Design a protein around this ligand. Sequence first.
Ligand SMILES: Nc1nc2c(ncn2[C@@H]2O[C@H](COP(=O)(O)OP(=O)(O)OP(=O)(O)O)[C@@H](O)[C@H]2O)c(=O)[nH]1
Ligand SMILES: Nc1nc2c(ncn2[C@@H]2O[C@H](COP(=O)(O)OP(=O)(O)OP(=O)(O)O)[C@@H](O)[C@H]2O)c(=O)[nH]1
Ligand SMILES: Nc1nc2c(ncn2[C@@H]2O[C@H](COP(=O)(O)OP(=O)(O)OP(O)(O)=S)[C@@H](O)[C@H]2O)c(=O)[nH]1
Ligand SMILES: Nc1nc2c(ncn2[C@@H]2O[C@H](COP(=O)(O)OP(=O)(O)OP(O)(O)=S)[C@@H](O)[C@H]2O)c(=O)[nH]1
Ligand SMILES: [Mg+2]
Ligand SMILES: [Mg+2]
Lengths: 429, 429, 131, 432, 432
Amino acid sequence: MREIVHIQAGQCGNQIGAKFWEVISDEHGIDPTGSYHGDSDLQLERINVYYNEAAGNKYVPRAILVDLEPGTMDSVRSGPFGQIFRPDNFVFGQSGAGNNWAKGHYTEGAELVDSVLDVVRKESESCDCLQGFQLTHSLGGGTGSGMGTLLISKIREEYPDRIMNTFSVVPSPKVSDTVVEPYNATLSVHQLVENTDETYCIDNEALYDICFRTLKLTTPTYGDLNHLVSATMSGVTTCLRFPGQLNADLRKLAVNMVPFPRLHFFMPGFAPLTSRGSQQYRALTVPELTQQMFDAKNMMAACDPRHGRYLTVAAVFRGRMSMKEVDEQMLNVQNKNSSYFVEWIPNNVKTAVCDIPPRGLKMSATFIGNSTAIQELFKRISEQFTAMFRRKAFLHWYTGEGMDEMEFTEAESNMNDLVSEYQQYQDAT
Amino acid sequence: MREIVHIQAGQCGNQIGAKFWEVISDEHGIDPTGSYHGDSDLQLERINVYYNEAAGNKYVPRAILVDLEPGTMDSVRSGPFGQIFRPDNFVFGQSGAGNNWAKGHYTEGAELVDSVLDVVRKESESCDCLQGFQLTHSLGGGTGSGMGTLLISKIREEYPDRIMNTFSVVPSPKVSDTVVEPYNATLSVHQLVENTDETYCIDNEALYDICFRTLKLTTPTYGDLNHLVSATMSGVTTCLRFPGQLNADLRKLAVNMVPFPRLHFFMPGFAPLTSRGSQQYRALTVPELTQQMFDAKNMMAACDPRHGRYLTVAAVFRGRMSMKEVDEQMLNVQNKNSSYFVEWIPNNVKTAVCDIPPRGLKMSATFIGNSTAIQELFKRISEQFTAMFRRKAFLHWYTGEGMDEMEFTEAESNMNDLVSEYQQYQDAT
Amino acid sequence: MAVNVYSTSVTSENLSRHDMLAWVNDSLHLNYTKIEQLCSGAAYCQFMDMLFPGCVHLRKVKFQAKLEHEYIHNFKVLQAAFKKMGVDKIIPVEKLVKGKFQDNFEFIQWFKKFFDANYDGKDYNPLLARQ
Amino acid sequence: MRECISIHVGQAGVQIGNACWELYCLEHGIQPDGQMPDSFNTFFSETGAGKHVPRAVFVDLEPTVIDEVRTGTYRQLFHPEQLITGKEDAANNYARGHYTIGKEIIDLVLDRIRKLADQCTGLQGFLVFHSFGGGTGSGFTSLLMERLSVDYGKKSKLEFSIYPAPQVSTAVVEPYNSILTTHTTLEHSDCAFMVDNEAIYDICRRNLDIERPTYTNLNRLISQIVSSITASLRFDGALNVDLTEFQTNLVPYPRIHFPLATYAPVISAEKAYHEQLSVAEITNACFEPANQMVKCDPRHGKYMACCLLYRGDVVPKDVNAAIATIKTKRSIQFVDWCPTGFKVGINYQPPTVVPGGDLAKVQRAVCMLSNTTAIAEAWARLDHKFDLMYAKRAFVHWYVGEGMEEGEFSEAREDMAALEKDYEEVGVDSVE
Amino acid sequence: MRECISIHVGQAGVQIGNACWELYCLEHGIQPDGQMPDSFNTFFSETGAGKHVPRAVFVDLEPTVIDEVRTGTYRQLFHPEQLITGKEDAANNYARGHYTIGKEIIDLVLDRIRKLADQCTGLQGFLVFHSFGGGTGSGFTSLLMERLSVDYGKKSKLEFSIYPAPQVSTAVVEPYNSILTTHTTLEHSDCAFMVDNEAIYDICRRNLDIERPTYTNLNRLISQIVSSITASLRFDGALNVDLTEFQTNLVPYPRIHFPLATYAPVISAEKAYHEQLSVAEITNACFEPANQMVKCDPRHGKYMACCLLYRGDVVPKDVNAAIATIKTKRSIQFVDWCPTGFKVGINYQPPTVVPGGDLAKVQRAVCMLSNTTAIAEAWARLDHKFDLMYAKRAFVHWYVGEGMEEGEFSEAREDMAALEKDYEEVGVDSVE
Ligand SMILES: Nc1nc2c(ncn2[C@@H]2O[C@H](COP(=O)(O)OP(=O)(O)OP(=O)(O)O)[C@@H](O)[C@H]2O)c(=O)[nH]1
Ligand SMILES: Nc1nc2c(ncn2[C@@H]2O[C@H](COP(=O)(O)OP(=O)(O)OP(=O)(O)O)[C@@H](O)[C@H]2O)c(=O)[nH]1
Ligand SMILES: Nc1nc2c(ncn2[C@@H]2O[C@H](COP(=O)(O)OP(=O)(O)OP(O)(O)=S)[C@@H](O)[C@H]2O)c(=O)[nH]1
Ligand SMILES: Nc1nc2c(ncn2[C@@H]2O[C@H](COP(=O)(O)OP(=O)(O)OP(O)(O)=S)[C@@H](O)[C@H]2O)c(=O)[nH]1
Ligand SMILES: [Mg+2]
Ligand SMILES: [Mg+2]
């Protein structure tokens, strides 16, 4: 009953993915071997959403791990929880893509993709009623971006009526992690616009800010960053996995959040977030949570929501709380912040409530904003792309793999059109 | 009540045969001395199918071991289980055939054949109701191929109303094990087409692939390969030896699988097949088994079933399982893979179920496919034969033993006709 | 005597998948839709005939090959043609015959360069060569 | 799995190789006899029981330098067939290296490479160590590269080069050798990492307080840089970079494939105790011109790519912070066609320190690979040097005597002229 | 049961025999006195109590070489009647070997063979060791073969031959001897395994690092090859090959019965420690022309049959894999009439190593027997040599003086011409 198929591509994709898996196992009372050691029957009721039941009281993640290099896979295998994964679901190459989108999409990735697809099909067939797919990856590298997009394209072709959702780690504005990342992102976005139903934009710049400023982590590590992402991810599927009072799911959320097909790029957020010492000096009531949710400093995408307008917002609450109170809070935010919400979508806040809170907390909240400010990010990428492409810098690395300028051009154009569309709705009255 | 007489020819024939015997003894609770040390009365009920009861609570395989060289026989005798065999049932020459079909069929083999026949007749007379004969051998050498075919011919003449089944190890496509193997195979096939009721085509190329890719055996050995073959073999007779819910036997299987007399060459398969570590991460339900059975990578013949159509498929299941489920699975495979099944044989899947599973497993499955793709193999052999015969290469080795070109020619023609026949049914609507 | 060339890393000296396949289809009058279809070796054998008539035993080529060994056979003919003409480039047969895109695309990149170095513009009807 | 084949050509290449393989052994816990009481495997193949053998070839045209290896401490480390020597050297003559003497052993060298490569399941590529100035380092290396390009195709090839200094030469004919080898190797190399002996000496004197640094010291320093480059492949890391990634991120146009290496921190133990070495602190050290290993001025050039490879106790956020501040800095200008100039690698393993070495043990290190229009200056200098001698045909008769043709000199020079112009063109900012 | 009778003719045959029987004794644990403190039995008959005697005949026309055996370490190993000597040698004259001197001992030799054969229950056949060049090796061997053909009929006969080198001769009349003996033996031999002293010397120098290899070394090497051929009969194996199988799988036409032997690996202990010797690795070694034991170029010929005999720690799948990759390789071309070119044998017993030998102890070995159109070159050379001397009738008077007729020379030559043409015809590919 509503199986989700999980896919992880590249280093980023696999590191976030592992963390996510760890989070989920703890929630469902699953230990590193796949055995259930939980307390309550509710933990097992909907375990089939993420786990296949194997022989002898074991549960195995419906997870496929993909990379053109093996080192990350090895690391995962050696990690805490590494042994829970099905060995045949690790599909790795030997070559790599050399941070090149073309290599991931057309060359090395192409050589590996069939093997992935075979696994995926089997996984799909395992499920009684497949909800769809969640892909974790970056847009800036070669495998996650090129191979990942290719995978998406094929999956969509095979299963056009199932939901495709992605958790994409997007390039940062202040500093680049690779030199060709604008190319890789731009290409990837071209695929994503046509082939995903929803995309959560996660940015490391935002994450670091959150960790340093809000969480008071002097020197946050990638693991810590991943944890936040995992928390968000778990939040989005909580209403599918536990009984609630007003229950959401992936389809409903998409419907509420996506008024036009191309505009499916979300700014995710999570609340609450406090230091170790600072948590004793404040109570986690719903209004506090709401307040934490609605501000620029708590968004995981490096763009200010105050630079645009919200088309829609979905808020997913976990824990025992008063529905009336929640509704009041939702009303209040809309009324007081009227100028940040588009005027032609009345009641553009959607609420979901799941009775099961996450571990350690009595209540939490997950925020999904569809904000016209995300256009800024796209614009930056377009600018960076242009600056390089006009001088044909690095181009021979991609053309050498069989790619043509036309493909690049078209991709750029598509990106530009999306930006224009975003602008149009931002400006409409 | 339904005695089977087992015959082993040459090195291959004897190595596979020994393994088979080992498998069978374990199943029926027989130790290396012939004494029953099993648990259940069901293990002894139908022990007479493969064993003669000797004086003093001992059971002896109804097995005849034949070779033109003694070394293999000696090895068998010295092996674990070597002492279980009747000493007078080892019939070996001193000369060999020098990898020459002619020597096996007309010369050295001829000198030994009468002695074999004498034993065989006695064995037949031992039995209350002889079902027939199973011969294990290769087609590529001299003894298994030439002597074996001769033996078959004589046996058929003597006992024309009994079933003759063969487990033939067929030459590989990528590499040849001997230079004259096309001649030896072609000649052998000429005899087999006219004198066997069913022939299981087993190919070492396929076997290695299975062992390396599916079983995750880095460096598989011939013993391991033989084990797989033995498992298949045991599977085919399981319904004759144990009570079941829908019981098959050798005759029934032949009837279901052979719509035209010459088309009796099967592609055998076995399921399940897993690594040592990988078995804990999956449950052996019937659908899984079915899925494992129906694919190209799990066939023990080096030909892709997707290059032809299935005329018929027999599936034999062992273990406690639901008949309904089995039937559903059978229906499902037919419906979804419609294009791979000939349209003029409705319901071309036959099912048998035996309640006794093999040791170590709760359920297993054995697959017998009559696929028009096997024609590829025959074509290859014909091509190889032609290439050599047109230049009369190596011919003096055979003509020197009294053989004429006419015999070769006729054999070639017969093979070609079979191929044509296969093609005709493949193409028919 | 036939001249020989090398390919590593150069700009404005490449060909897109589409363009390369167009070239192969126009040159040999066939209808490939994937560059990986060149893995059968028949096309390469034909190209050798067109470049250096008599360097290849085309009567031995299997133009309707479907199986790995058939493809291997074509590449043996190609190998022999290369040896006869003194082209020193090692053909990665095992990788090519698996029909992998990367290996085939790199090989055709080199082959195109080799062809351009050596082709004198003569016209021939490849249909007769084929059958 | 991801094997890396190392080739050490001529005296410089061999001697640096000695330093590199010594370091690798210490890093993987391999003794000088090949024994150890899984990460090693990219650099060492394994045989029988309790022995590990470098994936390396050492070649020189004379026996003396390699004979030291044969008779020395690591005699048991290498298999005899991977230590290749001729009889007579190339006598600082590219011609002898490329043609007369080199054509006698090239087949042998390549045959052994083929044998090495046959035992690789996932060959990443080749690391070639040599100099620009020697007859073997110039002529033989060029030859070798040509053959490798033919026999292996698009497999990644990397070069570590002792580029000639502005005012510190050994030979008189260095400019000739440098120019010809650059010309001949250009279309065959994917990326070449220049290093300059003068600069390293300065570093040794200034940063390590060494009055009289020896070639050994330089070699040791080089070994550190090489280790940083391959540590991402030999160890687990937070964010990883492989040999194929460099040429993508550091080479914007095919001919402009000369990034420069800078390592930090290079300090003595006595000096290390009074300093806390943060990521910001070492990054700043790197991005200051005095710590560079080529005697050139980046302040007078523009950056086209920077790749920063951190190792040890390093935290991604910290690195990001460090880089951000360096971006602001006046002394760091980037070309106008390149808004993203940084590629960043972070590996968990701290730099290993050779017993009896000049460097102190640190919790963090960083190796920057940067590509700068300032390198054009060096090329200009070299061309000028060539011009001065060639105008008089000084030493030309030697080259011709070894089978070179005079026209090839002019050819090499014109190609280098073109190269110089290419850099210049790249330098200028975009119209509109 | 499956007995094998060995005949050692002349100096080469006897000396190689010394090396072979020394090896067999070590392999079966038989002491030099015939004692041991069941596999032996194909090569050794057993007598009374605690003594084992070679199924062998040693023959030479002079006493000196056999006298060494009689007085030597293995004096007690052989029965006196199996060591046969005349008084005067054949003086490098085929005529003396075949007629004048040979006709005096042929009856004796055959009588002893008959006695040996009478104690065999399952005679597989004969292994005959000799050379092409000596008067005994050429003339006597031919005589012997003729008689054996008559008295035993279709029993398999195999030859191991020291074929003459291209540019390394002992005698001047070698070509005459070679040609006549090949002519006379051709219709009587089923398969003959050529080996060349030059090639073995090269192997010794190149692969074993021996400055000055002696005939002993060569003999030892030969003994290995012979052991590989008969190990399948003397030991248990996974997949087996017997003496009757070779002639079926290696001889496509009656006259084309000259396969060539190649053994791998041939290494010293010092070199073996840095190498892991896989099936693929040794197979590749074998299939490279430098490791061949006849100085000929297979790259310039085509293979008609290859038989690969593996021994020791060898796994069938691995062998299959190895062969498959070699099939792809450009340097391996097969004749068009032969889509299946490989016969493969695998035996469990690792190669035994003679104490004080030049070869290191390995887990695996392989012996290839291959038949190649490249052998035609050797024949052409030999014919040319014959022609040059015969045109002047150089040395002819000797042969005539010993009862040969001049017409027989021309006869031999024409037969060899025909043989040469037969190879040529076989070479070309099939029409349509
Ligand atoms: N860093 C460093 N540079 C070296 C070393 N040895 C030589 N060099 C430099 O290399 C150049 C001389 O080239 P060599 O490698 O000695 O010459 P070669 O390659 O042996 O060539 P020939 O002797 O001419 O055959 C000069 O610029 C030297 O300063 C060394 O151990 N370390
Ligand atoms: N490999 C090897 N070759 C040998 C040996 N002794 C001789 N030869 C070769 O055998 C040929 C000479 O023939 P021999 O066997 O000495 O002569 P013979 O058979 O005794 O004949 P006559 O003395 O003429 O009666 C030359 O090609 C020698 O190189 C040996 O111990 N080993
Ligand atoms: N939050 C988070 N971001 C990461 C992680 N790993 C990498 N990134 C970010 O993702 C980008 C590169 O991701 P990466 O994983 O290298 O893509 P890739 O395609 O797998 O890289 P490749 O195989 O082509 S070399 C960088 O911007 C980096 O900052 C991680 O574990 N967590
Ligand atoms: N699966 C399997 N195949 C084998 C075995 N032994 C041999 N073969 C295969 O069978 C073929 C040769 O079989 P072999 O047993 O030599 O026939 P034979 O007739 O007995 O051989 P001979 O007496 O004429 S020399 C080869 O292709 C080989 O790969 C075995 O134990 N298992
Ligand atoms: Mg030198
Ligand atoms: Mg003599």
